[PDB]
Amino acid sequence: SDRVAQLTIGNSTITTQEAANIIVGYGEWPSYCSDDDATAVDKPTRPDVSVNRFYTLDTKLWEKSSKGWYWKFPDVLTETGVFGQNAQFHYLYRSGFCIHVQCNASKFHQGALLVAILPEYVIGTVAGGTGTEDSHPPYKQTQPGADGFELQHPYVLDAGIPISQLTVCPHQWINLRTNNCATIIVPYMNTLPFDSALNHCNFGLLVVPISPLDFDQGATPVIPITITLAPMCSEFAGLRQAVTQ
Amino acid sequence: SDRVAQLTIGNSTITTQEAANIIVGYGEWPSYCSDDDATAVDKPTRPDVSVNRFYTLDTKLWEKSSKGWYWKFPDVLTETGVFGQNAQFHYLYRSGFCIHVQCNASKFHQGALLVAILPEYVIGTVAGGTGTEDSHPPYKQTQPGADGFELQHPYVLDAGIPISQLTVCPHQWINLRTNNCATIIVPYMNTLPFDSALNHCNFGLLVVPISPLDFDQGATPVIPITITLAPMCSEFAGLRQAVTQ
Amino acid sequence: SDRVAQLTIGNSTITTQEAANIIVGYGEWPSYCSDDDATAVDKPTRPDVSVNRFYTLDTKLWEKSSKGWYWKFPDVLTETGVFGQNAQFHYLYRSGFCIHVQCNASKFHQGALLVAILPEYVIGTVAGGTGTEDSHPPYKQTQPGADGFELQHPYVLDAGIPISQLTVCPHQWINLRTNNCATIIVPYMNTLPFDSALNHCNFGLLVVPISPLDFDQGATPVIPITITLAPMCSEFAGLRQAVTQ
Amino acid sequence: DRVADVIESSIGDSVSRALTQALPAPTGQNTQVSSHRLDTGEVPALQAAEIGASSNTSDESMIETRCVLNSHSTAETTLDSFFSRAGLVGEIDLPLEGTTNPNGYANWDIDITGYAQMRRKVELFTYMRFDAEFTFVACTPTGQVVPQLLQYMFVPPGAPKPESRESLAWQTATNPSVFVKLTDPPAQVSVPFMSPASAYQWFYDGYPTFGEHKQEKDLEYGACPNNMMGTFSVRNVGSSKSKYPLVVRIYMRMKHVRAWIPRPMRNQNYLFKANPNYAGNSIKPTGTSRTAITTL
Amino acid sequence: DRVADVIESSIGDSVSRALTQALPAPTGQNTQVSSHRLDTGEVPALQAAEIGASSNTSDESMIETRCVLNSHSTAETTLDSFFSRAGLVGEIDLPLEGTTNPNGYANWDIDITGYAQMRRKVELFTYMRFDAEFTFVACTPTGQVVPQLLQYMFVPPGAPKPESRESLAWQTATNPSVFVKLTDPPAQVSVPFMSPASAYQWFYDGYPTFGEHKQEKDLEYGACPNNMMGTFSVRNVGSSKSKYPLVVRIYMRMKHVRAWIPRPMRNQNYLFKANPNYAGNSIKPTGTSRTAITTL
Amino acid sequence: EIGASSNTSDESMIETRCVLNSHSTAETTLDSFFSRAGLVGEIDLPLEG
Amino acid sequence: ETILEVNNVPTNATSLMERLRFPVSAQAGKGELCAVFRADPGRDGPWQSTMLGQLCGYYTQWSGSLEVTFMFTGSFMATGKMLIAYTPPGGPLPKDR
Amino acid sequence: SIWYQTNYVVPIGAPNTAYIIALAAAQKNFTMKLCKDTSHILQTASIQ
Ligand SMILES: Cc1cc(CCCCCCCOc2ccc(C3=NCCO3)cc2)on1
Ligand SMILES: Cc1cc(CCCCCCCOc2ccc(C3=NCCO3)cc2)on1
Secondary structure, three states: OOOEEEEEOOOOEEOOOOOOOOEEHHHHOOOOOOOOOOOOOOOOOHHHHOOOOOOEEEEEEEEOOOOOOEEEEEHHOOOOOOHHHHHEEEEEEEEEEEEEEEEEOOOOOOEEEEEEEEEEEOOOEEEOOOOOOOOOOOHHHOOOOOOOOOOOOHOOOOOOOOHHHHHHHHHEEEOOOOOOOOEEEEEOOOOOOOOOOOOOOOOEEEEEEEEEEOOOOOOOOOOOEEEEEEEEEEEEEEEOOOOOO | OOOEEEEEEEEEEEEEOOOOOOOHHHHOOOOOOOOOOOOOOOOOOOOOOHHHOEEEEEEEEEEOOOOOOOHHHHHHOOOOOOHHHHHHHHHEEEEEEEEEEOOOOOOEEEEEEEEEEEEEOOOOOOOOOOOOOOOOOOHHHHHHOOOOEEOOHHHHHOOOOOHHHHOOOOEEEOOOOOOEEEEEEEOOOOOOOEEEOOOOEEEEEEEEEEEEEEEEOOOOOOOOEEEEEEEEEEEEHHHHHHHHO | OOOOOOEEEOOOEEEOOOOOOOOHHHOOOOOOOOOOOOOEEEEOOOOOOOHHHHHHEEEEEEEEOOEEEEEHHHHOOOOOHHHHHHHHHEEEEEEEEEEEEEEOOOOOOEEEEEEEEEEOOOOOOOOOOOOOOOOOOOOOOOOOOOOOEEEEOOHHHHOOHHHOOOOOOOOEEOOOOOEEEEEEEEOOOOOOOEEEOOOOOOOEEEEEEEEEOOOOOOOOOOEEEEEEEEEEOOOOEEOOOOOOO | OOOOOHHHOOOOOOOOOOOOHHHHHHHOOOOOOOOOOOOOOOOOOOOOHHHHHOOOEEEEEEHOOEOOOOOEEEEHHOOHHHHHOOOOEEEEEEEEOOOOOOOEEEEEOHHHHHHHHHHHHOOOOOEEEEEEEEEEEEOOOOOOOOEEEEEEEEEEEOOOOOOOOOHHHHHOOOOOEEEEOOOOEEEEEEEOOOOOOOOOOOOEEEOOOOOOOOOOOOHHHHHHHHOOOEEEEEEEOOOOOOOEEEEEEEEEEEEEEEEEEOOOOOOOOOOOOOEEOOOOOOOOOOOOOOOOOOOO | OOHHHHHHOOOEEEEEEEOOOOOOOOOOOOEEEOOOOOOOOOOOOOOOOHOOOOOOOHHHHOOOOOOOOOOOOOOOHHHHHOOOOOOOEEEEEEEOOOOOOOOOEEEEEHHHHHOOOHHHHHHEEEEEEEEEEEEEEOOOOOOOOOOOEEEEEEOOOOOOOOOOOOOOHHOOOOOOOEEOEEEEEEEEEEEOOOOOOOOOOOOOOOOOOOOOOOOEEEEOOOOOOOOOOEEEEEEOOOOOOOOOEEEEEEEEEEEEHHHHHHHHOOOOOOEOEEEOOOOOEEEEEEEOOOOOOOOO | OOOOOOOOOHHHHOOOHHHHHOOOOOHOOOOHHHOOOOEEEEOOOOOHH | EEEEEEOOOOOOOOOOOHHOOEEEEOOOOOOEEEEEEOOOOOOOOHHHOHHHHHHOOOOOOOHHHHHEEEEEOEEEEEEEEEEEOOOOOOOOOOOOO | OOOOOOOEEOOOOOOOEEEEEEEEEEEOOOEEEEEOEEEOOOOOOOOO
């Protein structure tokens, strides 16, 4: 009664028989915005079930040489579903998330993925190699939406910070000999009650292989990793027309 | 909550995730010597933590043809550690033991070791084969210390007694499909409150493969067996200079 | 009932019929380490009788021209006895001492030895005579163990300090017309609850002839001085393998 | 005032933990009624020998049973019951012509491991404490009873061992002797548990000397002085030749027995006293043998 | 249940026996009246130095005395009283032309044993715990005050020690620095008892390494890391040549002092820091000398 | 994998004595750690340049 | 807890990621040595990759016990018993198990 | 130091080599005092 679990939100239900408990980001469940914390004077929309549900957005293939991937969050879920819509029509957005990364293999396979939540995950460039050029990461890299982006220098999280310390962040590992999925529940985290789901990304989801995937030849070599996230306590205010970016 | 266990004594801690309960020799925990059971009038030394701890003394390799091994006890732990010292400096010694034999393999390997505690384990010779010669087992055989000794005729425990009955002694098996270690806790057993740790061996530790080790080729063939013992309620009296034997 | 005395510790008993009372260093009996004074979190070993006893380590010959000798302490008792062992196996050591220096002669002999306890007795060199060379006393001189070392410039205790003032330290004299032995009882003294018995020497034992030995010819001329010390409230923690230095 | 770890420090507990208690077993266990049990979760029949404990499965949970009031006794399987039976342990010859024991006297080292029946029984346990009743059946080699007077003298280790039929030690001023005619019923005597140990030790894994332990001395491995009770000396009471060839059979019967640490029963033939040596080439199986595990 | 010798076993007594108590000594001891005493048996004047205790003979028992109410204070002889006086402990040069410390910055190893007056005072005791007030008097070699801005930075052992006047460590983001003009009154600061030990140790009889201890390493005998408080760095605050030659005198004044284990006062001249070496050939007596014990 | 730091106490890993830890944690607070002046800006006002 | 770079050997910049974990594989003998490291936190070495290590660099002194959890990432089928040993001060790097 | 108590055992079909990841932190009784600046790092070029 700790390795098996079921997550049910909206009209979606995730099952898992090898999970390793659930992490609750910074030990705080997602809440709605207080009356004294808010400033936007208009009564917000709380679609509830139409947006607070499990969107299974992407699948990556883990290979004996994969570097790792990340997904910026507020964004990843735009354009997809009713959530996407409310995020485009409204200026202000607010919401916590239930992230469930899954990836299974056999008892004869081995490997270990680090799954973390890095708030305000600002990306940096290699500065033209030498460090004299003041380059900047492109829209395609800082806000990749679904499909995420692949890391080029995971050791420093493409941002000059050691991944060795990335665990001071809500994390969970996917050790194949132990489990087959991670489950983080992040609350809304920003220095503001609401912000634009479009141009600001509250945090990134990191999935990095720290202990390389490996298996004797002959065992199914296609080992996918699938991301499934679900917004929680979604609130929207500041209604205008629909906006893409 | 019965196959996993942790043994902690002194500054040593053994972990096991496939153990099969703990046997307590003759159903009696090791105790200190009573005031009416003792005779030595000098106040003894009870080093406690400096000698009551887990010494991991030896490793043997189990092979598809191994005969079996034994270790005489009081002795095995001499020369090694502070225990060794107190055993050489003092004439009189007294102590119970926590013996933990470990040996793991894969779920694809198979075999079964008998692990017993035979008190007053006197060794005998083959009597020159024919039985006319009154030979005697050498110091190197009766008191092998660590490294133990290998049995030459396990069927009779090199002492003319059936191993088939060796189970009337505190024992435990290491069946590879079931566990990966044995744990016996023997109390001090002698017809005297104290005796010389040097020239008298209260009991021997037997480790014999009754069901031969076997595995299809290609699976790691080096299957070790490691002995780890820990004295308990060690008491020493009769202090003189240090003696080897 | 003040000139005769008997000291009994462990299994050792010293007798004296001409002693001149007992000095207790800084007026404090040796104690064990308090729970609020200690830091080492591991439960220590208190061998008691096996190490708290009278080791009669050395004998020097007093001659009409002897300069004086010293013994650094924590150290002097290493390698010798069970105490030695616990001091090598353990990192941390703590203990007070009962030092009994003895030396007798006839009522027709005369002389007077100063017996002091100098804490943190750092030795110094003559600096190459002139004082331009920054020489340093060798391991053989700063930590002579038993056998002690002979002073080369007693007037300054080979450390640039007047021996004339050495009495502000727990001391006692051995005036031959009065007594035949000194007895100092030093408590553990350091700025730490425990320290390495190996590389730190809490204090030195000084034995210097202030009033030269003398006697008309024909009287036995071999006048020895024997050191006998006994640890008290010995405690050891931080167990590892055995270390010499 | 104290240091806590000293107030707790359970170091010095003279009492043994136990875990098991002794219960009354006058009769065999009775059998209570059983009925069919078809349920998941409870599996008596399933055990794990690895643990090291004997299966605790009751007849009742293995088959539907009736009720049986077992009143069979267990008295005959006690130690006094089992061991308190006289048996041969020593034999002594006092021949007229020969090289064994002429001169009319003999010194028998008190060692009960010289006769296989009795030996095997006791070697069932490692330690044993008890009193005993020694009986001495003497007669000529033909089993013929003769009018001869003997003197049996127990000589504790340290007492002067008789060197001749007319030795001075036969004054037996403190040693306990017994004078008997071979025509009188066998002499019989009660012997206490005399040993410096708390129990006799059939097996002593170690040496007594404490020295070097070279090859020439491996003779002492297994020799425990706490069992060397001394010698038993006998002599025809006289100054001249006995006139008849004698033999004394020594029978010992234990009583007030306490036994501890049971060990495997002797599997092979015995070769020497106080020495478990066995014939290396003639290592026979414990029991009988068949032609196949699939046939009787 | 216990073994007695365990119930007694006073092993683990954390409290020290004592034997002596501290009494109030605000004034010197008063003198009470004395009168002639002609009696056998009581001999105050007779002592035995061998014991190892100072004579306890009172003025009263040595001569007929009057009564004196001694109200003289003992406040000036306390430790805070004695030690809490600023004294020179460090000196630093920042010359324009030279080889000592050009480049405009200096790293002074915080060691108060470089100046004989102050050193001798403290070396009176083996251990010493206390807070201190450091004052820094800066000016040119002529004692002339100049409009220059310095920066004093305390660099704990482990922090990056400045390699140049424009080093990055001068950002002093966590180290405590002090910026001062040489025209401002001397900078002064309060320093806590910062050490991993409970008291600073003037003498450490032993090594810190724990290794072999060969000849080349005897350099470390007597070096106790619990006194290595790090370095004190100073620099003229700029990018270019200071323009004036500077000198900083460091004065330390102890307060809230605790001292233990008094030892003999330094008898000979000092030769090196943290090292009691003395001139072997020039070993002068402790004091003055006369021509004979029978004349002044 | 859970994602939580090991909660194993020294006590359950070895036989321990009793220690009254009175060491403070005041110096590791935020005000304590961050409230130390540091250089953040530098400005030049040269004559020629 | 943060990742301790016990395997602080590789520097090829294409192998920086393999500092985070050390290997363990089928041995052919008895009691071989897997890895070794200074248990000092504020010192140069593996401890520098940790969050603790880094915060120490900001404080002159410290006190307290340290914990080092070792997670095994091999396959589910792999068995094994390792012996992790902390040798206090003065104890030279052990020559054998 | 980490030694092999026994050995890394594997069936035919599993990798003959795997890795261990070490993670470290301080116990509840851990405290630090007297703060200074880090040494571990110091930049080289001045921040543009
Ligand atoms: C009268 C009279 C009575 C006697 C004989 C008294 C004999 C008492 C014998 C007690 C024997 O106890 C034994 C215990 C152990 C062994 C033994 N042999 C091999 C090692 O153990 C032999 C005897 O002689 N005279
Ligand atoms: C602002 C500011 C303040 C400072 C200086 C702070 C100095 C704190 C010094 C504490 C010194 O304690 C000592 C103890 C022992 C010894 C010693 N030297 C030889 C061995 O003992 C020296 C100093 O720098 N900048």
